């Protein structure tokens, strides 16, 4: 059995500028099978109000999801996406890098 | 959404008949023909979904999707082919839309016609007089009665298998005093040479 | 095995009475259907069941309900019969649904007649008429005729019995009955049948001929208030012996 | 118009974790979800407002019944696969069916299955046969190819019905599907030059880097086209700078029949 680990990309809806409201996106894709856990982090703390698209299907049989939350970026606040999947022994954290 | 097929067709034993079906439906996922003998259940005959002709024994089924048209072709007709034939189409939502059916009537080939009207023996338990018109060629039609106290049944094809012999007949009866076999079938056009045995 | 088994074959009902039609299939099919068939029109779906555990309305659901009791069985319920529900009901099944090419497998049909008043229900009179001697001398064949007359509704099965065994060769029974008063909507019916044998067979005095009509009519729980006999389900017959 | 497609996916899971559906089926037009069904809701529901507004309740009701049956068929098929593979545990079964209406008016049609996310059976609607990837599939191939009428049914569905549905849904969704939002494109330094585009629709775009007027696909890092969350998309591509020679670099972006060049000074 071949299991595929998720690719994980963290980015803002629009080019970020401090003090300007935005959306922080975490797009998790290419994974198989479909069970997956995704959190958005602010300074290492889980964000509560986080929405996500329904599970989506790719032609190559893998799955993808978009997780997002509204936010206003500041110089000091650090954001990340934490993902767990059967292919990961530990949760993987990808920091937002602007 | 409409299916159309003729109500009735009549052909001769041994010949070929084409039963047509046209349809106008909301999408198309295939066309079925079923056979339904009188009083019995429909049974599946054929399915077409691409264009062209498909053969199964003595039956073939044709489809033209652009004409919205199919026929069921019966070759070498046998008496057992007498039945209704139902056309049905699956639409875009897989709903089956049914045609009203074509009743196929088969005329037997009567090799040695011997048309005759016979008086059956009275039953001591009935007040009816009973006449049998029999052995006439299949082109003869039997008209229903025009006297309301006379009952005339349509022709029926009987098969005497051990003798490989088929015959048409119709029955007339009445309890009226003026009923006689010599006049029972007066409303039908019967063969000039019909045999009427003496009273 | 058995295919699609539905019951009952025939049923008379009074307006307002309740009725359940049973259907079972033993073909491990997933989809089941109830249709009605009426003269002059194509089959109309009443209710269907695409899979075990789900059912939905067809084109004519009003006055009916269904139960997909399990994977094998799909029953049809008439809670309060109406005259418009007089019809022939067919249960059918298919392996799946929502696939193009799979065909339907039909049950034998259930003929229901719903009447405002059961006083229109009559069994047949049955009479047998022996062959014409002129036929025998002209053709060397002998045609017996059976008449089943005066019955209503058209729920009958006629059979011929020669020497105590049912026969079919040499028989022709009218495919449709004759309305005795064709201008009346509830006309009683007549049905004729013929049995033709060789003259030698008819002339054996040991040969015996019977015409038997099974009539499907009323049962114990139907209420009867007429002066004549209750027209229950019953067999009416008449016989003839060969003549040396 | 541009190329468009309609696709329906199914996912079956043999031993799902508590709460997780054993069956899901989702339709798409292009990248847009249009329909959803699963074994928990047991209802087919719209996933785009322009589907809800244009398909009457009898459509959803009827396909709800069909999907309840397709759900059961899927469970039976997966049960049969996992027994013939002799597999324990939870395994997946997937199906994808659909069609494309290409810009030039030609069409494609496809139907395929996967077990545990790997190709299992692939339909060829021209030779009317199934390609099996192993001997479990080969057994299924023989049974399905034995039902010749079903192969013809699927060819007609893919070539005629599916294209008809696609055109109907494209008209429903035309204000979404047939619009164009041009990209906003910028270059920055991070040494590598990044070319970044955002706010565009449809998601199909081509970004690349040219050095002295020649493309160099092997030296370019292509970023994925990604959803921004608002219906538009973003993408990027980067190239590293040669500090030993002067070279003219330029970002080239092609979107919906428009080409853009950003020359780096
Ligand atoms: Na109802």
Short mmCIF file of N, CA, C and O in Angstrom, two decimals, chain C residues 45-150:
data_model
loop_
_atom_site.label_atom_id
_atom_site.label_comp_id
_atom_site.label_asym_id
_atom_site.label_seq_id
_atom_site.Cartn_x
_atom_site.Cartn_y
_atom_site.Cartn_z
N UNK C 45 -45.22 4.10 -13.20
CA UNK C 45 -44.54 3.70 -11.97
C UNK C 45 -45.28 4.32 -10.78
O UNK C 45 -45.64 5.51 -10.82
N UNK C 46 -45.54 3.52 -9.75
CA UNK C 46 -46.27 4.01 -8.57
C UNK C 46 -45.28 4.47 -7.50
O UNK C 46 -45.32 5.63 -7.06
N UNK C 47 -44.40 3.56 -7.10
CA UNK C 47 -43.33 3.79 -6.13
C UNK C 47 -42.19 2.89 -6.55
O UNK C 47 -42.39 1.89 -7.25
N UNK C 48 -40.98 3.23 -6.13
CA UNK C 48 -39.85 2.36 -6.41
C UNK C 48 -38.91 2.41 -5.22
O UNK C 48 -39.08 3.22 -4.30
N UNK C 49 -37.94 1.53 -5.25
CA UNK C 49 -37.00 1.34 -4.14
C UNK C 49 -35.66 1.06 -4.80
O UNK C 49 -35.41 -0.05 -5.27
N UNK C 50 -34.79 2.09 -4.88
CA UNK C 50 -33.55 1.96 -5.67
C UNK C 50 -32.58 0.99 -5.02
O UNK C 50 -31.74 0.40 -5.71
N UNK C 51 -32.70 0.78 -3.72
CA UNK C 51 -31.78 -0.04 -2.95
C UNK C 51 -32.49 -0.45 -1.67
O UNK C 51 -33.45 0.22 -1.26
N UNK C 52 -31.98 -1.47 -1.00
CA UNK C 52 -32.53 -1.75 0.32
C UNK C 52 -32.42 -0.49 1.18
O UNK C 52 -31.43 0.26 1.08
N UNK C 53 -33.46 -0.18 1.95
CA UNK C 53 -33.38 0.95 2.86
C UNK C 53 -33.79 2.30 2.30
O UNK C 53 -33.64 3.31 3.00
N UNK C 54 -34.29 2.37 1.06
CA UNK C 54 -34.80 3.62 0.52
C UNK C 54 -35.94 3.33 -0.46
O UNK C 54 -35.94 2.31 -1.15
N UNK C 55 -36.91 4.24 -0.51
CA UNK C 55 -38.05 4.17 -1.42
C UNK C 55 -38.36 5.60 -1.82
O UNK C 55 -37.98 6.55 -1.12
N UNK C 56 -39.11 5.77 -2.92
CA UNK C 56 -39.54 7.11 -3.31
C UNK C 56 -40.73 6.96 -4.25
O UNK C 56 -40.95 5.91 -4.86
N UNK C 57 -41.45 8.06 -4.40
CA UNK C 57 -42.60 8.09 -5.29
C UNK C 57 -42.20 7.95 -6.75
O UNK C 57 -41.13 8.40 -7.18
N UNK C 58 -43.08 7.33 -7.53
CA UNK C 58 -42.96 7.33 -8.99
C UNK C 58 -43.84 8.42 -9.55
O UNK C 58 -43.97 9.51 -8.97
N UNK C 59 -44.49 8.12 -10.68
CA UNK C 59 -45.36 9.09 -11.35
C UNK C 59 -46.78 9.13 -10.77
O UNK C 59 -47.43 10.18 -10.83
N UNK C 60 -47.29 8.02 -10.23
CA UNK C 60 -48.68 8.03 -9.73
C UNK C 60 -48.77 7.52 -8.29
O UNK C 60 -49.43 6.52 -8.02
N UNK C 61 -48.12 8.19 -7.34
CA UNK C 61 -48.08 7.66 -5.96
C UNK C 61 -49.36 7.87 -5.16
O UNK C 61 -49.50 7.25 -4.12
N UNK C 62 -50.24 8.77 -5.56
CA UNK C 62 -51.35 9.13 -4.70
C UNK C 62 -52.33 7.98 -4.57
O UNK C 62 -52.74 7.40 -5.58
N UNK C 63 -52.68 7.65 -3.31
CA UNK C 63 -53.55 6.53 -2.99
C UNK C 63 -52.84 5.25 -2.62
O UNK C 63 -53.51 4.25 -2.25
N UNK C 64 -51.51 5.26 -2.64
CA UNK C 64 -50.65 4.12 -2.41
C UNK C 64 -49.55 4.49 -1.44
O UNK C 64 -49.21 5.66 -1.25
N UNK C 65 -48.95 3.46 -0.86
CA UNK C 65 -47.72 3.56 -0.09
C UNK C 65 -46.97 2.25 -0.28
O UNK C 65 -47.57 1.25 -0.65
N UNK C 66 -45.67 2.24 0.04
CA UNK C 66 -44.91 1.01 -0.10
C UNK C 66 -44.07 0.77 1.13
O UNK C 66 -43.74 1.70 1.87
N UNK C 67 -43.64 -0.48 1.29
CA UNK C 67 -42.63 -0.81 2.28
C UNK C 67 -41.58 -1.73 1.67
O UNK C 67 -41.90 -2.83 1.21
N UNK C 68 -40.32 -1.27 1.67
CA UNK C 68 -39.20 -2.14 1.30
C UNK C 68 -38.78 -2.83 2.59
O UNK C 68 -37.92 -2.33 3.34
N UNK C 69 -39.42 -3.97 2.86
CA UNK C 69 -39.33 -4.63 4.17
C UNK C 69 -37.92 -5.12 4.40
O UNK C 69 -37.42 -5.08 5.53
N UNK C 70 -37.26 -5.58 3.34
CA UNK C 70 -35.90 -6.09 3.36
C UNK C 70 -35.43 -6.11 1.91
O UNK C 70 -36.10 -5.55 1.03
N UNK C 71 -34.29 -6.75 1.64
CA UNK C 71 -33.74 -6.72 0.29
C UNK C 71 -34.62 -7.50 -0.69
O UNK C 71 -34.61 -7.20 -1.89
N UNK C 72 -35.35 -8.51 -0.19
CA UNK C 72 -36.17 -9.38 -1.04
C UNK C 72 -37.58 -8.84 -1.29
O UNK C 72 -38.18 -9.14 -2.34
N UNK C 73 -38.14 -8.06 -0.37
CA UNK C 73 -39.56 -7.83 -0.39
C UNK C 73 -39.94 -6.37 -0.48
O UNK C 73 -39.37 -5.51 0.21
N UNK C 74 -40.98 -6.10 -1.25
CA UNK C 74 -41.42 -4.73 -1.50
C UNK C 74 -42.93 -4.80 -1.60
O UNK C 74 -43.47 -5.28 -2.60
N UNK C 75 -43.63 -4.32 -0.58
CA UNK C 75 -45.07 -4.47 -0.56
C UNK C 75 -45.72 -3.14 -0.95
O UNK C 75 -45.15 -2.06 -0.76
N UNK C 76 -46.92 -3.25 -1.52
CA UNK C 76 -47.68 -2.11 -2.01
C UNK C 76 -49.00 -2.04 -1.26
O UNK C 76 -49.74 -3.03 -1.20
N UNK C 77 -49.32 -0.88 -0.70
CA UNK C 77 -50.48 -0.75 0.18
C UNK C 77 -51.48 0.21 -0.43
O UNK C 77 -51.11 1.33 -0.79
N UNK C 78 -52.75 -0.20 -0.48
CA UNK C 78 -53.88 0.66 -0.84
C UNK C 78 -54.64 0.84 0.46
O UNK C 78 -55.37 -0.07 0.89
N UNK C 79 -54.47 1.99 1.11
CA UNK C 79 -55.11 2.14 2.41
C UNK C 79 -56.62 2.23 2.29
O UNK C 79 -57.34 1.72 3.15
N UNK C 80 -57.13 2.89 1.24
CA UNK C 80 -58.57 3.11 1.07
C UNK C 80 -58.90 3.02 -0.42
O UNK C 80 -58.89 4.03 -1.13
N UNK C 81 -59.24 1.81 -0.89
CA UNK C 81 -59.31 1.59 -2.33
C UNK C 81 -60.35 2.49 -2.98
O UNK C 81 -61.41 2.77 -2.42
N UNK C 82 -60.03 2.98 -4.16
CA UNK C 82 -60.91 3.77 -4.99
C UNK C 82 -61.12 3.08 -6.34
O UNK C 82 -60.22 2.38 -6.84
N UNK C 83 -62.28 3.28 -6.96
CA UNK C 83 -62.53 2.67 -8.27
C UNK C 83 -61.46 2.96 -9.31
O UNK C 83 -61.22 2.09 -10.15
N UNK C 84 -60.82 4.13 -9.27
CA UNK C 84 -59.77 4.47 -10.22
C UNK C 84 -58.55 3.57 -10.05
O UNK C 84 -57.70 3.53 -10.95
N UNK C 85 -58.47 2.86 -8.94
CA UNK C 85 -57.35 1.97 -8.69
C UNK C 85 -57.60 0.57 -9.27
O UNK C 85 -56.73 -0.29 -9.17
N UNK C 86 -58.76 0.33 -9.85
CA UNK C 86 -58.95 -0.84 -10.69
C UNK C 86 -57.87 -0.90 -11.77
O UNK C 86 -57.75 0.04 -12.56
N UNK C 87 -57.08 -1.96 -11.79
CA UNK C 87 -55.93 -1.95 -12.70
C UNK C 87 -55.25 -3.30 -12.62
O UNK C 87 -55.67 -4.15 -11.83
N UNK C 88 -54.16 -3.49 -13.36
CA UNK C 88 -53.31 -4.65 -13.21
C UNK C 88 -51.99 -4.18 -12.67
O UNK C 88 -51.34 -3.31 -13.28
N UNK C 89 -51.57 -4.72 -11.52
CA UNK C 89 -50.38 -4.23 -10.83
C UNK C 89 -49.24 -5.18 -11.07
O UNK C 89 -49.40 -6.40 -10.91
N UNK C 90 -48.09 -4.63 -11.46
CA UNK C 90 -46.91 -5.46 -11.68
C UNK C 90 -45.80 -5.00 -10.77
O UNK C 90 -45.46 -3.81 -10.74
N UNK C 91 -45.22 -5.94 -10.05
CA UNK C 91 -43.98 -5.74 -9.31
C UNK C 91 -42.84 -6.06 -10.25
O UNK C 91 -42.97 -6.98 -11.06
N UNK C 92 -41.73 -5.33 -10.16
CA UNK C 92 -40.59 -5.67 -11.01
C UNK C 92 -39.33 -5.44 -10.19
O UNK C 92 -39.38 -4.80 -9.15
N UNK C 93 -38.21 -6.01 -10.64
CA UNK C 93 -36.93 -5.80 -9.98
C UNK C 93 -35.83 -5.72 -11.03
O UNK C 93 -35.97 -6.22 -12.16
N UNK C 94 -34.72 -5.12 -10.65
CA UNK C 94 -33.53 -5.12 -11.52
C UNK C 94 -32.29 -5.20 -10.63
O UNK C 94 -32.36 -4.90 -9.43
N UNK C 95 -31.16 -5.57 -11.22
CA UNK C 95 -29.98 -5.80 -10.39
C UNK C 95 -29.60 -4.52 -9.64
O UNK C 95 -29.40 -4.54 -8.42
N UNK C 96 -29.51 -3.39 -10.37
CA UNK C 96 -29.29 -2.05 -9.78
C UNK C 96 -30.23 -1.05 -10.45
O UNK C 96 -31.03 -1.41 -11.32
N UNK C 97 -30.11 0.23 -10.11
CA UNK C 97 -30.70 1.24 -10.98
C UNK C 97 -29.73 2.40 -11.17
O UNK C 97 -28.79 2.60 -10.41
N UNK C 98 -29.99 3.18 -12.21
CA UNK C 98 -29.01 4.23 -12.48
C UNK C 98 -27.85 3.73 -13.28
O UNK C 98 -26.78 4.35 -13.31
N UNK C 99 -28.03 2.56 -13.87
CA UNK C 99 -27.18 2.01 -14.91
C UNK C 99 -28.05 1.87 -16.15
O UNK C 99 -29.24 1.60 -16.05
N UNK C 100 -27.46 2.03 -17.32
CA UNK C 100 -28.29 2.13 -18.49
C UNK C 100 -28.89 0.80 -18.90
O UNK C 100 -30.07 0.71 -19.25
N UNK C 101 -28.07 -0.25 -18.93
CA UNK C 101 -28.49 -1.34 -19.77
C UNK C 101 -29.26 -2.42 -19.02
O UNK C 101 -29.80 -3.32 -19.66
N UNK C 102 -29.33 -2.37 -17.70
CA UNK C 102 -29.95 -3.50 -17.00
C UNK C 102 -31.47 -3.50 -17.16
O UNK C 102 -32.12 -2.46 -17.01
N UNK C 103 -32.04 -4.67 -17.46
CA UNK C 103 -33.46 -4.83 -17.72
C UNK C 103 -34.24 -5.10 -16.43
O UNK C 103 -33.68 -5.37 -15.36
N UNK C 104 -35.56 -4.98 -16.56
CA UNK C 104 -36.51 -5.31 -15.52
C UNK C 104 -36.95 -6.76 -15.63
O UNK C 104 -37.06 -7.32 -16.72
N UNK C 105 -37.21 -7.37 -14.48
CA UNK C 105 -37.78 -8.72 -14.37
C UNK C 105 -39.12 -8.54 -13.69
O UNK C 105 -39.18 -7.99 -12.59
N UNK C 106 -40.19 -9.02 -14.32
CA UNK C 106 -41.53 -8.72 -13.86
C UNK C 106 -42.14 -9.92 -13.13
O UNK C 106 -41.92 -11.07 -13.51
N UNK C 107 -42.94 -9.62 -12.12
CA UNK C 107 -43.87 -10.59 -11.54
C UNK C 107 -45.08 -10.87 -12.46
O UNK C 107 -45.26 -10.24 -13.50
N UNK C 108 -45.93 -11.82 -12.02
CA UNK C 108 -47.03 -12.30 -12.85
C UNK C 108 -48.17 -11.31 -12.96
O UNK C 108 -49.03 -11.51 -13.83
N UNK C 109 -48.21 -10.29 -12.12
CA UNK C 109 -49.30 -9.34 -12.15
C UNK C 109 -50.38 -9.67 -11.13
O UNK C 109 -50.60 -10.83 -10.77
N UNK C 110 -51.05 -8.62 -10.66
CA UNK C 110 -52.15 -8.71 -9.70
C UNK C 110 -53.31 -7.90 -10.26
O UNK C 110 -53.20 -6.68 -10.40
N UNK C 111 -54.43 -8.57 -10.56
CA UNK C 111 -55.56 -7.84 -11.15
C UNK C 111 -56.52 -7.44 -10.05
O UNK C 111 -57.07 -8.31 -9.35
N UNK C 112 -56.72 -6.12 -9.86
CA UNK C 112 -57.62 -5.61 -8.83
C UNK C 112 -58.81 -4.91 -9.46
O UNK C 112 -58.65 -4.12 -10.39
N UNK C 113 -60.00 -5.17 -8.93
CA UNK C 113 -61.19 -4.45 -9.34
C UNK C 113 -61.81 -3.87 -8.06
O UNK C 113 -62.06 -4.61 -7.11
N UNK C 114 -61.99 -2.56 -8.04
CA UNK C 114 -62.54 -1.86 -6.88
C UNK C 114 -63.92 -1.38 -7.26
O UNK C 114 -64.08 -0.71 -8.28
N UNK C 115 -64.93 -1.76 -6.46
CA UNK C 115 -66.34 -1.52 -6.79
C UNK C 115 -67.02 -0.74 -5.67
O UNK C 115 -66.73 -0.94 -4.49
N UNK C 116 -67.94 0.15 -6.05
CA UNK C 116 -68.72 0.87 -5.05
C UNK C 116 -69.59 -0.07 -4.24
O UNK C 116 -69.81 0.15 -3.04
N UNK C 117 -70.06 -1.14 -4.87
CA UNK C 117 -71.02 -2.08 -4.28
C UNK C 117 -70.70 -3.46 -4.82
O UNK C 117 -70.60 -3.63 -6.05
N UNK C 118 -70.60 -4.44 -3.93
CA UNK C 118 -70.29 -5.80 -4.37
C UNK C 118 -71.49 -6.51 -4.99
O UNK C 118 -71.36 -7.64 -5.44
N UNK C 119 -72.63 -5.84 -5.10
CA UNK C 119 -73.78 -6.52 -5.68
C UNK C 119 -73.65 -6.74 -7.18
O UNK C 119 -74.55 -7.32 -7.78
N UNK C 120 -72.58 -6.24 -7.79
CA UNK C 120 -72.33 -6.45 -9.21
C UNK C 120 -71.50 -7.69 -9.48
O UNK C 120 -71.21 -7.99 -10.64
N UNK C 121 -71.11 -8.42 -8.43
CA UNK C 121 -70.20 -9.54 -8.55
C UNK C 121 -71.04 -10.80 -8.76
O UNK C 121 -71.97 -11.05 -8.00
N UNK C 122 -70.74 -11.56 -9.82
CA UNK C 122 -71.41 -12.79 -10.20
C UNK C 122 -70.42 -13.87 -10.63
O UNK C 122 -69.54 -13.58 -11.43
N UNK C 123 -70.61 -15.13 -10.22
CA UNK C 123 -69.78 -16.21 -10.77
C UNK C 123 -70.24 -16.56 -12.17
O UNK C 123 -71.33 -16.16 -12.59
N UNK C 124 -69.49 -17.33 -12.94
CA UNK C 124 -69.98 -17.76 -14.26
C UNK C 124 -70.97 -18.91 -14.14
O UNK C 124 -70.89 -19.73 -13.23
N UNK C 125 -71.93 -18.93 -15.07
CA UNK C 125 -72.58 -20.19 -15.43
C UNK C 125 -71.66 -20.88 -16.42
O UNK C 125 -71.10 -20.22 -17.30
N UNK C 126 -71.50 -22.19 -16.30
CA UNK C 126 -70.61 -22.91 -17.20
C UNK C 126 -71.40 -24.03 -17.88
O UNK C 126 -72.06 -24.82 -17.19
N UNK C 127 -71.33 -24.09 -19.22
CA UNK C 127 -72.02 -25.14 -19.97
C UNK C 127 -71.12 -25.67 -21.09
O UNK C 127 -70.33 -24.93 -21.69
N UNK C 128 -71.25 -26.98 -21.36
CA UNK C 128 -70.48 -27.66 -22.40
C UNK C 128 -71.44 -28.18 -23.46
O UNK C 128 -72.45 -28.82 -23.14
N UNK C 129 -71.07 -27.97 -24.71
CA UNK C 129 -71.89 -28.35 -25.86
C UNK C 129 -71.11 -29.36 -26.70
O UNK C 129 -69.95 -29.11 -27.06
N UNK C 130 -71.73 -30.50 -26.98
CA UNK C 130 -71.06 -31.61 -27.65
C UNK C 130 -70.98 -31.39 -29.16
O UNK C 130 -71.76 -30.60 -29.73
N UNK C 131 -70.00 -32.00 -29.80
CA UNK C 131 -69.72 -31.72 -31.23
C UNK C 131 -70.90 -32.03 -32.13
O UNK C 131 -71.70 -32.94 -31.89
N UNK C 132 -70.97 -31.25 -33.20
CA UNK C 132 -71.92 -31.49 -34.29
C UNK C 132 -71.60 -32.78 -35.04
O UNK C 132 -70.47 -33.01 -35.47
N UNK C 133 -72.61 -33.64 -35.23
CA UNK C 133 -72.37 -34.84 -36.02
C UNK C 133 -71.99 -34.50 -37.44
O UNK C 133 -71.26 -35.26 -38.09
N UNK C 134 -72.50 -33.39 -37.97
CA UNK C 134 -72.11 -33.00 -39.34
C UNK C 134 -70.63 -32.65 -39.42
O UNK C 134 -69.97 -32.96 -40.44
N UNK C 135 -70.09 -32.00 -38.37
CA UNK C 135 -68.65 -31.73 -38.35
C UNK C 135 -67.88 -33.04 -38.38
O UNK C 135 -66.90 -33.20 -39.13
N UNK C 136 -68.31 -34.00 -37.56
CA UNK C 136 -67.61 -35.27 -37.48
C UNK C 136 -67.58 -35.95 -38.84
O UNK C 136 -66.53 -36.40 -39.29
N UNK C 137 -68.73 -35.97 -39.55
CA UNK C 137 -68.75 -36.67 -40.83
C UNK C 137 -68.02 -35.90 -41.93
O UNK C 137 -67.45 -36.52 -42.83
N UNK C 138 -68.00 -34.57 -41.86
CA UNK C 138 -67.36 -33.78 -42.92
C UNK C 138 -65.85 -33.64 -42.76
O UNK C 138 -65.13 -33.49 -43.77
N UNK C 139 -65.35 -33.63 -41.51
CA UNK C 139 -63.96 -33.28 -41.23
C UNK C 139 -63.20 -34.37 -40.51
O UNK C 139 -61.98 -34.24 -40.37
N UNK C 140 -63.89 -35.38 -39.96
CA UNK C 140 -63.27 -36.40 -39.11
C UNK C 140 -62.66 -35.77 -37.86
O UNK C 140 -61.71 -36.31 -37.27
N UNK C 141 -63.18 -34.60 -37.48
CA UNK C 141 -62.76 -33.94 -36.25
C UNK C 141 -64.00 -33.55 -35.49
O UNK C 141 -65.10 -33.51 -36.05
N UNK C 142 -63.83 -33.25 -34.19
CA UNK C 142 -64.98 -33.00 -33.31
C UNK C 142 -64.64 -31.87 -32.34
O UNK C 142 -63.69 -32.00 -31.54
N UNK C 143 -65.39 -30.76 -32.40
CA UNK C 143 -65.14 -29.58 -31.60
C UNK C 143 -66.17 -29.49 -30.49
O UNK C 143 -67.37 -29.34 -30.75
N UNK C 144 -65.69 -29.52 -29.23
CA UNK C 144 -66.55 -29.25 -28.08
C UNK C 144 -66.42 -27.77 -27.80
O UNK C 144 -65.36 -27.18 -28.03
N UNK C 145 -67.51 -27.16 -27.31
CA UNK C 145 -67.50 -25.76 -26.93
C UNK C 145 -67.90 -25.64 -25.46
O UNK C 145 -68.86 -26.29 -25.00
N UNK C 146 -67.19 -24.79 -24.75
CA UNK C 146 -67.51 -24.40 -23.37
C UNK C 146 -67.88 -22.92 -23.37
O UNK C 146 -67.15 -22.10 -23.93
N UNK C 147 -68.99 -22.58 -22.71
CA UNK C 147 -69.39 -21.19 -22.51
C UNK C 147 -69.43 -20.90 -21.01
O UNK C 147 -70.13 -21.60 -20.25
N UNK C 148 -68.73 -19.85 -20.60
CA UNK C 148 -68.74 -19.35 -19.23
C UNK C 148 -69.37 -17.98 -19.32
O UNK C 148 -68.79 -17.07 -19.94
N UNK C 149 -70.56 -17.81 -18.73
CA UNK C 149 -71.35 -16.63 -19.06
C UNK C 149 -71.87 -15.94 -17.80
O UNK C 149 -72.04 -16.58 -16.76
N UNK C 150 -72.13 -14.65 -17.91
CA UNK C 150 -72.77 -13.92 -16.84
C UNK C 150 -71.88 -13.55 -15.67
O UNK C 150 -72.42 -13.18 -14.62
#
